[PDB]
Amino acid sequence: STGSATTTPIDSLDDAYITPVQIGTPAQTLNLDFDTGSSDLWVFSSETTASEVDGQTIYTPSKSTTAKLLSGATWSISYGDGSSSSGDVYTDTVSVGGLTVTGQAVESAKKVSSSFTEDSTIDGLLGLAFSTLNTVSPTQQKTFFDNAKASLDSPVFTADLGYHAPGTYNFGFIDTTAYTGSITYTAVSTKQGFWEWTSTGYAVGSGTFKSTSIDGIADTGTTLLYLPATVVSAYWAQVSGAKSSSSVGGYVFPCSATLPSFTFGVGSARIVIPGDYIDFGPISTGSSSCFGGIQSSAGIGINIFGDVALKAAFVVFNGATTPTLGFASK
């Protein structure tokens, strides 16, 4: 089997991407944030504290003839940005782009933190990291991809995120029309539960490539590109007036600037992020100071190839017995 679904930016900055997902019988369609950095499929629901729902579409398990309460199961998750959610668990039928999993754990939120409430466009998350990170207790549950894998034509999914435009998540096949050149595959460590890999270096604008190993995670759920302080300083030094602002929480730059591109290495291959992908707009409405899309990972403890990087590529998440990642230009 295969599936194919369009993923759409939530706003004009590509702060996140939402993909429609069918849950239950009859189907209830919710728009979920597909997150290769976590492993829980959780939804706003008829059980979510009413004051914490503000415009989201909710899953109502009592209206699904295939929903079953997973007796005794609870979940609770905290994300890298400080947001969180928790609740109980059902199993139900879940379909993405024509690919159906029966018996998928659907984690129903009883509580969500303010950042989730305040984002009316995101109805929940669909985790695509390794199932070892799933938070359900006392019996850990599998991701949608893990459940689907054996049925897929090939045990892969691909992320093709757009810059200020829709893109595609495919399951079970590689669309050879969606990229240019070849796909370069690189080794993955699953030891921390992430799609963790090592980039071979970077360049800023038209500058020379610096060969240096950068270990980090391919994370569709994270908006920005988080890299070591040395790399990030070298990038922003090429932007007149850019500076790190402790009050704002990272590098800012004059909105009048023209940003240089940023290149990262994948083996001997190179992925070029155009400068305008690094512009996240005014820090507050009407400001002429703009927020940068490349930020330091110092203090995070891990480098994160988030959407800023991934949207410059066609990315293969290969879930073969030994997982690997593939990157192509497009």
mmCIF file of C-alpha atoms in Angstrom:
data_model
loop_
_atom_site.group_PDB
_atom_site.id
_atom_site.type_symbol
_atom_site.label_atom_id
_atom_site.label_comp_id
_atom_site.label_asym_id
_atom_site.label_seq_id
_atom_site.Cartn_x
_atom_site.Cartn_y
_atom_site.Cartn_z
ATOM 1 C CA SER A 1 0.000 0.000 0.000
ATOM 2 C CA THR A 2 0.890 3.688 -0.213
ATOM 3 C CA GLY A 3 -0.481 7.023 0.945
ATOM 4 C CA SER A 4 -0.014 10.601 -0.251
ATOM 5 C CA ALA A 5 -1.266 13.739 1.517
ATOM 6 C CA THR A 6 -0.742 17.445 0.979
ATOM 7 C CA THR A 7 0.779 19.434 3.832
ATOM 8 C CA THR A 8 -0.001 23.159 4.078
ATOM 9 C CA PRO A 9 1.710 25.989 6.008
ATOM 10 C CA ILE A 10 -0.414 27.297 8.866
ATOM 11 C CA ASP A 11 0.529 30.929 8.209
ATOM 12 C CA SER A 12 2.511 33.202 5.907
ATOM 13 C CA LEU A 13 5.799 32.426 7.710
ATOM 14 C CA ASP A 14 5.641 28.612 7.498
ATOM 15 C CA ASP A 15 5.576 28.456 11.299
ATOM 16 C CA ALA A 16 4.280 24.876 11.011
ATOM 17 C CA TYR A 17 2.559 22.610 8.492
ATOM 18 C CA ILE A 18 -0.772 20.790 8.801
ATOM 19 C CA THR A 19 -1.860 17.612 7.037
ATOM 20 C CA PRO A 20 -5.440 16.274 7.017
ATOM 21 C CA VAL A 21 -5.921 12.935 8.784
ATOM 22 C CA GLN A 22 -9.084 10.807 8.891
ATOM 23 C CA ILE A 23 -9.862 9.291 12.311
ATOM 24 C CA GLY A 24 -12.722 6.961 13.157
ATOM 25 C CA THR A 25 -15.871 5.696 11.492
ATOM 26 C CA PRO A 26 -17.439 7.686 9.958
ATOM 27 C CA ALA A 27 -14.269 9.648 9.361
ATOM 28 C CA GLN A 28 -13.516 12.713 11.460
ATOM 29 C CA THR A 29 -10.919 14.789 9.606
ATOM 30 C CA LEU A 30 -8.436 16.665 11.804
ATOM 31 C CA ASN A 31 -5.466 18.743 10.635
ATOM 32 C CA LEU A 32 -2.372 17.394 12.362
ATOM 33 C CA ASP A 33 1.225 18.574 12.653
ATOM 34 C CA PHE A 34 3.385 15.712 11.341
ATOM 35 C CA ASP A 35 6.383 15.678 13.677
ATOM 36 C CA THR A 36 9.459 13.528 12.946
ATOM 37 C CA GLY A 37 10.819 14.637 16.350
ATOM 38 C CA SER A 38 8.167 12.945 18.507
ATOM 39 C CA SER A 39 6.227 9.687 18.605
ATOM 40 C CA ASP A 40 2.705 10.388 19.906
ATOM 41 C CA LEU A 41 -0.433 10.826 17.765
ATOM 42 C CA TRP A 42 -2.563 13.090 19.948
ATOM 43 C CA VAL A 43 -5.658 15.144 19.218
ATOM 44 C CA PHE A 44 -7.890 17.811 20.615
ATOM 45 C CA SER A 45 -11.036 15.971 21.609
ATOM 46 C CA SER A 46 -14.426 16.057 23.278
ATOM 47 C CA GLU A 47 -12.463 15.348 26.491
ATOM 48 C CA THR A 48 -10.221 18.438 26.267
ATOM 49 C CA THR A 49 -10.826 21.009 29.025
ATOM 50 C CA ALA A 50 -13.304 23.366 27.386
ATOM 51 C CA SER A 51 -11.415 26.570 28.273
ATOM 52 C CA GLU A 52 -8.343 25.119 26.511
ATOM 53 C CA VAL A 53 -10.126 24.692 23.149
ATOM 54 C CA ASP A 54 -10.199 27.793 20.958
ATOM 55 C CA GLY A 55 -11.217 26.992 17.382
ATOM 56 C CA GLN A 56 -9.631 23.557 16.900
ATOM 57 C CA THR A 57 -11.514 20.688 15.353
ATOM 58 C CA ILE A 58 -12.027 17.956 17.957
ATOM 59 C CA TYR A 59 -12.138 14.172 17.803
ATOM 60 C CA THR A 60 -15.238 12.753 19.499
ATOM 61 C CA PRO A 61 -14.613 9.044 20.149
ATOM 62 C CA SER A 62 -18.229 8.382 21.203
ATOM 63 C CA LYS A 63 -19.268 9.176 17.605
ATOM 64 C CA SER A 64 -16.822 6.640 16.114
ATOM 65 C CA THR A 65 -18.111 3.081 15.856
ATOM 66 C CA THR A 66 -14.532 1.794 15.660
ATOM 67 C CA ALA A 67 -13.166 3.686 18.696
ATOM 68 C CA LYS A 68 -12.234 1.643 21.755
ATOM 69 C CA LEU A 69 -10.944 3.015 25.035
ATOM 70 C CA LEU A 70 -7.478 1.598 25.771
ATOM 71 C CA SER A 71 -8.163 0.647 29.348
ATOM 72 C CA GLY A 72 -5.859 2.229 31.906
ATOM 73 C CA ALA A 73 -3.657 4.007 29.369
ATOM 74 C CA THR A 74 -2.586 7.614 29.829
ATOM 75 C CA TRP A 75 -0.062 9.872 28.136
ATOM 76 C CA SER A 76 1.784 13.084 28.906
ATOM 77 C CA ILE A 77 4.320 14.870 26.744
ATOM 78 C CA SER A 78 6.515 17.946 26.918
ATOM 79 C CA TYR A 79 8.110 19.391 23.800
ATOM 80 C CA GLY A 80 11.372 21.204 23.220
ATOM 81 C CA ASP A 81 9.634 24.585 23.077
ATOM 82 C CA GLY A 82 8.105 24.108 26.543
ATOM 83 C CA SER A 83 4.594 23.211 25.384
ATOM 84 C CA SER A 84 2.816 20.116 26.689
ATOM 85 C CA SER A 85 -0.353 18.047 26.633
ATOM 86 C CA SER A 86 -1.781 14.939 28.323
ATOM 87 C CA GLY A 87 -4.814 12.672 28.453
ATOM 88 C CA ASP A 88 -6.143 9.174 27.845
ATOM 89 C CA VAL A 89 -6.019 6.804 24.885
ATOM 90 C CA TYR A 90 -8.324 5.185 22.344
ATOM 91 C CA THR A 91 -7.573 2.863 19.468
ATOM 92 C CA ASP A 92 -9.299 3.691 16.187
ATOM 93 C CA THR A 93 -8.912 3.589 12.426
ATOM 94 C CA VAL A 94 -6.601 6.301 11.094
ATOM 95 C CA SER A 95 -6.033 7.111 7.413
ATOM 96 C CA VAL A 96 -3.495 9.474 5.823
ATOM 97 C CA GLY A 97 -3.744 10.190 2.142
ATOM 98 C CA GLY A 98 -5.478 6.878 1.402
ATOM 99 C CA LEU A 99 -3.260 4.724 3.658
ATOM 100 C CA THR A 100 -5.252 3.129 6.502
ATOM 101 C CA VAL A 101 -4.108 1.735 9.858
ATOM 102 C CA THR A 102 -6.618 -0.071 12.041
ATOM 103 C CA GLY A 103 -6.075 -0.140 15.786
ATOM 104 C CA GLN A 104 -3.899 2.975 15.862
ATOM 105 C CA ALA A 105 -3.433 4.567 19.282
ATOM 106 C CA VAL A 106 -5.157 7.945 19.210
ATOM 107 C CA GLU A 107 -4.176 9.922 22.292
ATOM 108 C CA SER A 108 -7.080 12.124 23.396
ATOM 109 C CA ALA A 109 -6.040 15.326 25.155
ATOM 110 C CA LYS A 110 -7.643 16.213 28.458
ATOM 111 C CA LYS A 111 -5.178 19.095 28.966
ATOM 112 C CA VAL A 112 -3.093 21.182 26.566
ATOM 113 C CA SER A 113 -0.760 24.089 27.271
ATOM 114 C CA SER A 114 -1.506 27.644 26.223
ATOM 115 C CA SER A 115 0.534 27.570 23.003
ATOM 116 C CA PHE A 116 -1.649 24.740 21.689
ATOM 117 C CA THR A 117 -4.888 26.482 22.708
ATOM 118 C CA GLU A 118 -3.713 29.675 21.033
ATOM 119 C CA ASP A 119 -3.038 27.964 17.696
ATOM 120 C CA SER A 120 -6.472 27.318 16.252
ATOM 121 C CA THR A 121 -5.030 25.738 13.080
ATOM 122 C CA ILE A 122 -3.361 22.691 14.686
ATOM 123 C CA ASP A 123 -5.766 19.959 15.848
ATOM 124 C CA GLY A 124 -3.005 17.719 17.228
ATOM 125 C CA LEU A 125 0.283 16.069 16.345
ATOM 126 C CA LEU A 126 1.173 12.914 14.421
ATOM 127 C CA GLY A 127 4.546 11.680 15.626
ATOM 128 C CA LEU A 128 6.948 10.106 13.130
ATOM 129 C CA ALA A 129 10.073 9.582 15.276
ATOM 130 C CA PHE A 130 10.814 6.093 16.610
ATOM 131 C CA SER A 131 8.179 4.386 18.732
ATOM 132 C CA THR A 132 10.655 4.082 21.636
ATOM 133 C CA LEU A 133 9.797 7.748 22.420
ATOM 134 C CA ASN A 134 6.025 7.158 22.680
ATOM 135 C CA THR A 135 4.741 8.372 26.066
ATOM 136 C CA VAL A 136 1.732 6.069 26.593
ATOM 137 C CA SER A 137 1.814 4.330 29.983
ATOM 138 C CA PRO A 138 1.788 1.598 31.145
ATOM 139 C CA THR A 139 1.931 0.047 27.639
ATOM 140 C CA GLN A 140 3.901 2.061 25.083
ATOM 141 C CA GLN A 141 2.187 2.428 21.696
ATOM 142 C CA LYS A 142 3.445 2.436 18.093
ATOM 143 C CA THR A 143 3.489 5.346 15.672
ATOM 144 C CA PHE A 144 1.316 5.452 12.577
ATOM 145 C CA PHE A 145 4.375 4.740 10.425
ATOM 146 C CA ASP A 146 5.516 1.825 12.589
ATOM 147 C CA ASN A 147 2.011 0.306 12.361
ATOM 148 C CA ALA A 148 1.806 0.839 8.593
ATOM 149 C CA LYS A 149 5.358 -0.132 7.683
ATOM 150 C CA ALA A 150 4.931 -3.838 6.960
ATOM 151 C CA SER A 151 2.001 -3.123 4.604
ATOM 152 C CA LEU A 152 3.790 -0.403 2.643
ATOM 153 C CA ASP A 153 5.263 -1.088 -0.788
ATOM 154 C CA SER A 154 8.598 0.128 0.641
ATOM 155 C CA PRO A 155 9.193 0.892 4.389
ATOM 156 C CA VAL A 156 9.685 4.619 3.882
ATOM 157 C CA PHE A 157 7.993 7.966 4.120
ATOM 158 C CA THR A 158 9.047 11.224 2.471
ATOM 159 C CA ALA A 159 8.740 14.875 3.464
ATOM 160 C CA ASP A 160 8.557 17.473 0.692
ATOM 161 C CA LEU A 161 7.783 20.700 2.512
ATOM 162 C CA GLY A 162 7.104 23.877 0.551
ATOM 163 C CA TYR A 163 8.462 27.385 1.042
ATOM 164 C CA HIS A 164 5.384 29.558 1.534
ATOM 165 C CA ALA A 165 3.449 26.901 -0.412
ATOM 166 C CA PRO A 166 1.895 23.443 0.046
ATOM 167 C CA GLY A 167 3.958 20.281 -0.093
ATOM 168 C CA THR A 168 3.555 16.537 0.311
ATOM 169 C CA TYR A 169 4.017 13.645 2.728
ATOM 170 C CA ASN A 170 4.177 10.278 0.954
ATOM 171 C CA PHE A 171 4.135 6.844 2.587
ATOM 172 C CA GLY A 172 5.477 3.701 0.975
ATOM 173 C CA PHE A 173 7.057 5.081 -2.201
ATOM 174 C CA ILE A 174 9.558 7.607 -3.518
ATOM 175 C CA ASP A 175 8.150 10.024 -6.126
ATOM 176 C CA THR A 176 11.077 10.265 -8.551
ATOM 177 C CA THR A 177 9.497 13.348 -10.185
ATOM 178 C CA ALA A 178 9.644 15.352 -6.933
ATOM 179 C CA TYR A 179 13.383 16.077 -6.825
ATOM 180 C CA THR A 180 16.348 16.888 -9.028
ATOM 181 C CA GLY A 181 19.601 14.956 -9.237
ATOM 182 C CA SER A 182 20.082 11.982 -6.924
ATOM 183 C CA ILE A 183 19.079 11.209 -3.359
ATOM 184 C CA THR A 184 22.113 10.997 -1.060
ATOM 185 C CA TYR A 185 21.576 8.620 1.838
ATOM 186 C CA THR A 186 23.314 9.013 5.177
ATOM 187 C CA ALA A 187 23.509 6.934 8.355
ATOM 188 C CA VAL A 188 21.007 7.307 11.227
ATOM 189 C CA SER A 189 21.419 6.659 14.932
ATOM 190 C CA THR A 190 18.174 5.648 16.636
ATOM 191 C CA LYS A 191 19.752 5.613 20.108
ATOM 192 C CA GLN A 192 17.885 8.755 21.254
ATOM 193 C CA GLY A 193 14.691 7.824 19.388
ATOM 194 C CA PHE A 194 15.198 10.479 16.699
ATOM 195 C CA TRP A 195 16.129 10.553 13.025
ATOM 196 C CA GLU A 196 19.648 11.536 14.093
ATOM 197 C CA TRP A 197 22.384 11.949 11.477
ATOM 198 C CA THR A 198 25.676 13.771 10.896
ATOM 199 C CA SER A 199 25.976 16.579 8.369
ATOM 200 C CA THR A 200 29.387 16.905 6.728
ATOM 201 C CA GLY A 201 29.636 20.710 6.978
ATOM 202 C CA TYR A 202 28.332 24.039 5.811
ATOM 203 C CA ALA A 203 28.848 27.158 3.719
ATOM 204 C CA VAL A 204 27.493 30.703 4.086
ATOM 205 C CA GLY A 205 26.398 32.355 0.853
ATOM 206 C CA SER A 206 29.022 31.963 -1.848
ATOM 207 C CA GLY A 207 31.738 31.220 0.721
ATOM 208 C CA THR A 208 33.916 28.161 0.875
ATOM 209 C CA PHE A 209 32.529 24.956 2.334
ATOM 210 C CA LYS A 210 33.726 24.112 5.849
ATOM 211 C CA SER A 211 34.092 20.364 6.358
ATOM 212 C CA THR A 212 32.984 19.618 9.923
ATOM 213 C CA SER A 213 30.727 16.977 11.457
ATOM 214 C CA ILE A 214 27.414 18.321 12.771
ATOM 215 C CA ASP A 215 25.271 15.735 14.555
ATOM 216 C CA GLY A 216 21.595 16.631 14.621
ATOM 217 C CA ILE A 217 18.033 15.502 14.060
ATOM 218 C CA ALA A 218 15.730 15.781 11.039
ATOM 219 C CA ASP A 219 12.667 17.317 12.723
ATOM 220 C CA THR A 220 9.631 18.368 10.687
ATOM 221 C CA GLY A 221 7.943 19.572 13.861
ATOM 222 C CA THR A 222 10.545 22.273 14.579
ATOM 223 C CA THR A 223 10.203 25.515 12.593
ATOM 224 C CA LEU A 224 13.810 26.729 12.560
ATOM 225 C CA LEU A 225 17.355 25.468 11.981
ATOM 226 C CA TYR A 226 19.311 25.154 15.270
ATOM 227 C CA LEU A 227 23.078 24.741 14.868
ATOM 228 C CA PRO A 228 26.243 25.201 16.957
ATOM 229 C CA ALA A 229 26.989 28.741 18.075
ATOM 230 C CA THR A 230 30.163 28.902 15.963
ATOM 231 C CA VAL A 231 28.233 28.078 12.762
ATOM 232 C CA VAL A 232 25.381 30.460 13.554
ATOM 233 C CA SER A 233 27.789 33.320 14.375
ATOM 234 C CA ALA A 234 29.540 32.782 11.042
ATOM 235 C CA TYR A 235 26.192 32.998 9.226
ATOM 236 C CA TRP A 236 24.900 36.166 10.894
ATOM 237 C CA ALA A 237 28.268 37.919 10.593
ATOM 238 C CA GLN A 238 27.458 38.093 6.863
ATOM 239 C CA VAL A 239 24.286 40.153 7.511
ATOM 240 C CA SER A 240 24.836 43.855 8.191
ATOM 241 C CA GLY A 241 23.290 44.847 11.502
ATOM 242 C CA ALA A 242 22.420 41.330 12.640
ATOM 243 C CA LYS A 243 22.864 40.618 16.327
ATOM 244 C CA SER A 244 21.898 38.178 19.034
ATOM 245 C CA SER A 245 19.234 39.671 21.283
ATOM 246 C CA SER A 246 18.787 38.101 24.710
ATOM 247 C CA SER A 247 15.536 40.043 25.143
ATOM 248 C CA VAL A 248 14.039 38.741 21.896
ATOM 249 C CA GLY A 249 15.506 35.258 22.300
ATOM 250 C CA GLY A 250 17.893 34.871 19.388
ATOM 251 C CA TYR A 251 19.426 36.443 16.328
ATOM 252 C CA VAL A 252 17.549 39.338 14.767
ATOM 253 C CA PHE A 253 18.408 41.328 11.671
ATOM 254 C CA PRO A 254 17.216 44.469 9.872
ATOM 255 C CA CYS A 255 14.127 43.644 7.855
ATOM 256 C CA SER A 256 15.727 45.605 4.963
ATOM 257 C CA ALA A 257 18.543 43.075 4.633
ATOM 258 C CA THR A 258 19.105 40.645 1.793
ATOM 259 C CA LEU A 259 19.977 37.342 3.515
ATOM 260 C CA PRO A 260 22.694 35.020 2.191
ATOM 261 C CA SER A 261 21.959 31.387 1.495
ATOM 262 C CA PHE A 262 23.117 28.605 3.816
ATOM 263 C CA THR A 263 24.450 25.282 2.524
ATOM 264 C CA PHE A 264 24.622 22.066 4.534
ATOM 265 C CA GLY A 265 26.423 18.872 3.605
ATOM 266 C CA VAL A 266 24.903 15.412 3.240
ATOM 267 C CA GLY A 267 27.862 13.168 2.529
ATOM 268 C CA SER A 268 29.495 14.688 -0.542
ATOM 269 C CA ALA A 269 26.195 16.308 -1.573
ATOM 270 C CA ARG A 270 25.080 19.827 -0.741
ATOM 271 C CA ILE A 271 21.633 21.254 0.088
ATOM 272 C CA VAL A 272 21.287 25.013 -0.420
ATOM 273 C CA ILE A 273 18.786 26.923 1.727
ATOM 274 C CA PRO A 274 17.946 30.199 -0.078
ATOM 275 C CA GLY A 275 18.328 33.332 1.997
ATOM 276 C CA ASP A 276 14.647 34.158 2.026
ATOM 277 C CA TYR A 277 13.889 30.837 3.762
ATOM 278 C CA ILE A 278 15.781 32.272 6.752
ATOM 279 C CA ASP A 279 13.500 35.336 7.125
ATOM 280 C CA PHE A 280 10.828 34.926 9.836
ATOM 281 C CA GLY A 281 9.573 38.483 9.616
ATOM 282 C CA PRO A 282 9.070 41.258 12.148
ATOM 283 C CA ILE A 283 9.690 40.354 15.773
ATOM 284 C CA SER A 284 6.412 42.120 16.624
ATOM 285 C CA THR A 285 3.801 43.661 14.379
ATOM 286 C CA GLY A 286 5.146 46.750 12.620
ATOM 287 C CA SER A 287 8.756 46.302 13.751
ATOM 288 C CA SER A 288 11.679 46.749 11.351
ATOM 289 C CA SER A 289 13.646 44.124 13.275
ATOM 290 C CA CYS A 290 13.185 40.642 11.840
ATOM 291 C CA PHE A 291 13.640 37.220 13.428
ATOM 292 C CA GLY A 292 16.264 34.889 12.024
ATOM 293 C CA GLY A 293 15.603 31.360 10.835
ATOM 294 C CA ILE A 294 19.023 30.021 11.870
ATOM 295 C CA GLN A 295 19.525 30.046 15.639
ATOM 296 C CA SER A 296 21.999 28.630 18.126
ATOM 297 C CA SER A 297 21.423 25.168 19.587
ATOM 298 C CA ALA A 298 23.570 26.025 22.616
ATOM 299 C CA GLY A 299 21.470 25.125 25.622
ATOM 300 C CA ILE A 300 19.150 22.837 23.632
ATOM 301 C CA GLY A 301 21.683 20.030 23.831
ATOM 302 C CA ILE A 302 21.077 18.885 20.253
ATOM 303 C CA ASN A 303 21.253 20.380 16.795
ATOM 304 C CA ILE A 304 17.929 20.441 14.940
ATOM 305 C CA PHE A 305 17.467 20.394 11.171
ATOM 306 C CA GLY A 306 13.960 21.828 11.317
ATOM 307 C CA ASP A 307 11.680 23.069 8.582
ATOM 308 C CA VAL A 308 14.047 25.846 7.414
ATOM 309 C CA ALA A 309 16.507 23.139 6.346
ATOM 310 C CA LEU A 310 14.115 20.355 5.397
ATOM 311 C CA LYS A 311 11.953 22.504 3.108
ATOM 312 C CA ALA A 312 15.007 23.078 0.887
ATOM 313 C CA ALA A 313 15.121 19.323 0.192
ATOM 314 C CA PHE A 314 13.186 16.204 -0.687
ATOM 315 C CA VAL A 315 13.760 14.058 2.417
ATOM 316 C CA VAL A 316 13.470 10.265 2.666
ATOM 317 C CA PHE A 317 12.868 8.705 6.088
ATOM 318 C CA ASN A 318 13.927 5.121 5.381
ATOM 319 C CA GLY A 319 12.567 2.764 8.030
ATOM 320 C CA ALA A 320 14.304 -0.365 6.790
ATOM 321 C CA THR A 321 15.827 -2.708 9.373
ATOM 322 C CA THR A 322 18.778 -0.310 9.559
ATOM 323 C CA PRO A 323 17.154 3.116 9.118
ATOM 324 C CA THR A 324 18.764 5.806 6.969
ATOM 325 C CA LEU A 325 17.924 9.332 5.779
ATOM 326 C CA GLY A 326 18.031 10.548 2.195
ATOM 327 C CA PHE A 327 18.279 14.116 0.926
ATOM 328 C CA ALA A 328 17.850 15.465 -2.601
ATOM 329 C CA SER A 329 17.719 18.956 -4.013
ATOM 330 C CA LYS A 330 14.468 19.980 -5.702
#
